[PDB]
Amino acid sequence: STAGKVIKCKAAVLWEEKKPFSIEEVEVAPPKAHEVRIKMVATGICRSDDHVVSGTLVTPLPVIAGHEAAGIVESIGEGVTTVRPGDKVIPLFTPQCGKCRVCKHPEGNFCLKNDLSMPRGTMQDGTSRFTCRGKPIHHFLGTSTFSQYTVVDEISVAKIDAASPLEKVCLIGCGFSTGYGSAVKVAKVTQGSTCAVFGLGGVGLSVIMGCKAAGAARIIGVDINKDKFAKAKEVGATECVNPQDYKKPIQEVLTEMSNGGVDFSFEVIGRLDTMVTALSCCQEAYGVSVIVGVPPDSQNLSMNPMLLLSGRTWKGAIFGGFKSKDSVPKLVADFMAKKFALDPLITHVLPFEKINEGFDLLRSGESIRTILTF
Amino acid sequence: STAGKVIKCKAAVLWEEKKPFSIEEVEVAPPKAHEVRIKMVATGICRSDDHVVSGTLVTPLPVIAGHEAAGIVESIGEGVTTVRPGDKVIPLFTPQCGKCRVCKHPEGNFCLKNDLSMPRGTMQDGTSRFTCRGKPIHHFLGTSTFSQYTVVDEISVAKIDAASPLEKVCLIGCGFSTGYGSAVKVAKVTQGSTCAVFGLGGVGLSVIMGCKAAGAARIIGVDINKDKFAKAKEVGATECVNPQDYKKPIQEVLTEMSNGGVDFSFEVIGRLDTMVTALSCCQEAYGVSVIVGVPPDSQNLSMNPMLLLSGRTWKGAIFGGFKSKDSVPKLVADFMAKKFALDPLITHVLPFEKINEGFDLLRSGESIRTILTF
Ligand SMILES: Nc1ncnc2c1ncn2[C@@H]1O[C@H](COP(=O)(O)OP(=O)(O)OC[C@H]2O[C@@H](O)[C@H](O)[C@@H]2O)[C@@H](O)[C@H]1O
Ligand SMILES: Nc1ncnc2c1ncn2[C@@H]1O[C@H](COP(=O)(O)OP(=O)(O)OC[C@H]2O[C@@H](O)[C@H](O)[C@@H]2O)[C@@H](O)[C@H]1O
Ligand SMILES: [Zn+2]
Ligand SMILES: [Zn+2]
Ligand SMILES: [Zn+2]
Ligand SMILES: [Zn+2]
């Protein structure tokens, strides 16, 4: 029907920092070589999208944001082989080009073609496929999922099982994989181990599920909001601790409770102080602490390097350490085989045109995850 | 001859902080159960011994310091099985009790019976075996090797090959193993990789040798003293860089030279700023930076956690990550089989009674390592 033609559809456009998203009629050019055009079925609202709004995550404006989605391939440009029209897909904010020294490395996943480091707001060829009233609109992280239709480079899209439910599995595009991979791929949580998870929003819940899939014996959820504990326990936390209940510092409580420190700690709040507390509460000799997110305007933290010298390991990663194009389809296969449950993460579902309401829910802390549906 | 009796010999005693060592006549009690008395053959002067002098490394005084040595077993207390009189040995400042949760762990080596964390200056049973004119003298790290004879717990001593030359292999007790293990056990340097080593004193040379044994392709030595480069190249550095030669920051030079950052960086200066530079110069996606020493009075460092979020790993360790009682005898076997060379590390050899001269050489930077011989 619409292959090789411009498509007019609606998108949420951010014209300037600190303003609401405007629903606009936009033109979406046909995909050029190695590009795929996708019809969006559902998209998650993530913190990172809010950082674009606030000017924290610097990216050229005006922009169509959104990076956590699923959809259906509408058409493919010249020389696309990995996907076909009608295939279900997940766009990847971390590409997997397969060629660079990161993609060749057994451990790396932060592909050198990413648009995160020095953002240009373009496709890989350096132009945009979006216009609004003749004016070009930037892409975001080579995904731009706040549009009924989007164009993405083939290196940034993963084919998933034909029978997948898209309203759930869009979370595999960011929040779930980030948390789950942090435990299963970055930390390599072992059977029988003790884990502590600082922050019980969506990504901390996903870390907990990863710790549980890896066979942790004890998983201690830490959060200053007691309302988060009920869901943390439902997905696998064996205990929950609220640092405001104590007279002593939380790392001293966690070191007492785990008889000398936890095997794996995970920082998923994004706060400087809690990064350092998380490192300290892991066992001095062989503890691993993983930093799951960092706000993109963070200052320096302050840390005594003696924490590392006994044998601790501090690490970070993007997208849970997963090589994106390889892993996403296998995570979706595991969901289809019922190995984990995404529904506890989904607290609100809104139609796309209520995007600004979605962001309010995110800003206020009522939501674990809001999904927008098209 | 002297088994089961007190032995009168000479030791170097530190009576107060910031004063020279006094050579004193001391009494060395016979070993009680699971203790070994050793006749010292040679002992290294290490930085850590100077930190005791300066009051940086807090330990009870008066004390017999020294922890890097080799010697010959003079007698064994009740229930010692791992060693016999006449066996060549290396005392271990990191014990290996075999029982605790660290010794049971495949990765840990900082045994919970160490005397480094909360120092008591005693044997494991809580008393001393040294007196000077009726006054008790503390032990240091359960070793105290600045004495013609010392008593150490069996968990702190390793039996080595009978044919070993003790004047060389005493370095296996601290400096060499720390550097070499940092590359071979903590970083797990891989074949073909690029490594950067900040600091080309004794331990940095040992890191270089570890990188070379592991098959690194390029090993970049970094040091502000150009006189260190000649030996760094002799043991395996492929290139040497002096940061004072440049107008730009060293991590930017190292990132240019290695086409996007090194695989493994090692900080072996002990300085805060250079810890952070070392982390930054490793590849963002899969780089590993290892902190080899920390001065025991270090302040906090200041660091942007964004360095970790792309995929870098920061780690530290004591004694090169090696389980001490298992590893020392195999390192000595490798020396005996000619797999590495300790002689480039040994720049000065002094008789024990010139200990204060040894420390001057260490304080001035003339020495790579001074060995004291008895
Ligand atoms: N000092 C604190 N100690 C413990 N918990 C805290 C503290 N301050 C805030 N929190 C809790 O941290 C949690 C933050 O959760 P969300 O804001 O829902 O965030 P989520 O989508 O999970 O991710 C937050 C962001 O931080 C990054 O580490 C992570 O990758 C993500 O980008 C909340 O449950 C909040 O109560
Ligand atoms: N800013 C700098 N940049 C690079 N090199 C430096 C700098 N400042 C000092 N150095 C160099 O660092 C080296 C320190 O070497 P030594 O003092 O001989 O120390 P060594 O016995 O090898 O160990 C020093 C201590 O630091 C710890 O990391 C290590 O484990 C040991 O405890 C010297 O070669 C010195 O020139
Ligand atoms: Zn790549
Ligand atoms: Zn996200
Ligand atoms: Zn032990
Ligand atoms: Zn030492």
Nearest CA in chain A to B318: A310
**Rounded to 5°, angle at Cα A347 from A341 and A349:** 105
Query: What domains are there in chain A, each with its CATH number?
Result: 1-178+318-374 (3.90.180.10), 179-317 (3.40.50.720)
The single-letter code of the amino acid at B151 is: V
DSSP string, A33-92: TTEEEEEEEEEE--HHHHHHHHTSS---SSB-----EEEEEEEE-TT--S--TT-EEEE-
Q: How many Å lie between the alpha carbon of A197 and the closest alpha carbon of chain B? A: 17
Between CA A167 and CA A72 the distance in angstroms is: 12
Show the tokens assigned to B107.
């990765």
Question: What six digits make up the tokens of A11?
Answer: 């998108």
B314 touches chain A (CB under 8 A): yes
Asked if B132 and B22 count as a contact pair (C-beta separation under 8 A), the reply is no
Q: CA-CA distance, A184 to A201, in Å (whole number)?
A: 18
Resolution to one decimal, Å? 1.8
Q: How many angstroms separate the CA atoms of A178 and A317, rounded?
A: 8
- B192 and A CB contact within 8 Å: no
CA atoms B254, B260, B265, B271: torsion sign: positive
Peptide bond into A296 cis (omega under 30): no
Which atom of ligand 2 lies closest to the CA of B200? 34
In whole angstroms, give the CA distance from residue B268 to residue B219.
Answer: 14
Nearest to A258 by CA among A239, A242, A276: A239
Measured in Å, how far apart are chain B's first and last C-alpha atoms?
20
Q: Whose CA is nearest to atom 16 of ligand 2?
A: B201
Contact indicator for B292, B314 with CB cutoff of 8 Å:
no
- A67, A211, A282, A324: which one is catalytic? A67
Cβ atoms A38, A9 nearer than 8 A: no
Q: What angle do CA A201, A202, A207 make, to 5 degrees?
A: 100
Whether residue B164 lies in the annotated active site = no
Alpha-carbon distance B186 to nearest alpha carbon in chain A (angstroms): 9
User: In chain A, what residues touch B192 (CB-CB under 8 Å)?
Assistant: none
The reply to whether B369 sits in an annotated binding site is yes
Cβ < 6 A, ligand 1 pocket: A 47, 178, 198-204, 222-225, 228, 243, 268-271, 274, 292-293
Question: What is the rounded distance in angstroms from the CA atom of residue B273 to the CA atom of residue B312?
Answer: 18
- Rounded CA-CA distance B367/A360 in Å is 65
Residues on chain A touching B287 (C-beta within 8 angstroms): none
Rounded Cα distance, A110 and A134, in Å: 34
- Integer angstrom CA distances of residue B25 from A335, B13, B134: 74, 9, 11
What residues 235-274 of chain B have any CB closer than 8 A to a CB of chain A?
A: 260, 272
* A358 token code pair: 């979605």
Beta-carbon neighbour count of residue A93 at 10 Å?
25
Q: What is the DSSP letter of B185?
A: I
As a whole number of angstroms, the distance between CA A31 and CA A45 comes to 25
Q: Among candidates A80, A87, A82, A50, which has minimal Cα distance to A67?
A: A50
Q: HSE, CB side, 13 Å, CA atoms: give it for residue B281.
A: 30
Q: How far, in Å, CA of A371 to CA of A72, rounded?
A: 17
- Which residue's structure tokens are 């942790």? A216
Place of tokens 């001859």: B1
Summarize the annotated binding site of A for Zn(2+) as residue ranges.
46, 48, 67, 97, 100, 103, 111, 174
The token pair at A236 is: 């696998």
Ranges of H-type helices in chain A? 47-54, 101-104, 166-169, 175-181, 202-213, 229-235, 250-257, 272-281, 306-309, 324-336, 355-364
Q: Are B39 and B71 in contact (CB under 8 A)?
A: yes
Question: What chain A residue is nearest to B104 in terms of C-alpha separation?
Answer: A286
Q: What number does the ligand 1 atom closest to the CA of A175 have?
A: 21
10 Å CB burial of residue A160 (0-12, 13-18, 19+) is buried
Residues 6+ apart with CB under 8 A from B35: B76, B77, B80, B123, B129, B151, B152, B153, B154
Neighbours of A302 (CB within 10 A): 13
Contact A290, A211 (CB under 8 A): no
Q: Between chains, do A285 and B109 touch, taking CB under 8 Å as contact? A: yes
Residue of A nearest to B291 (CA): A309
- If one counts every other C-beta atom within 10 angstroms of the C-beta of residue B127, the result is 11
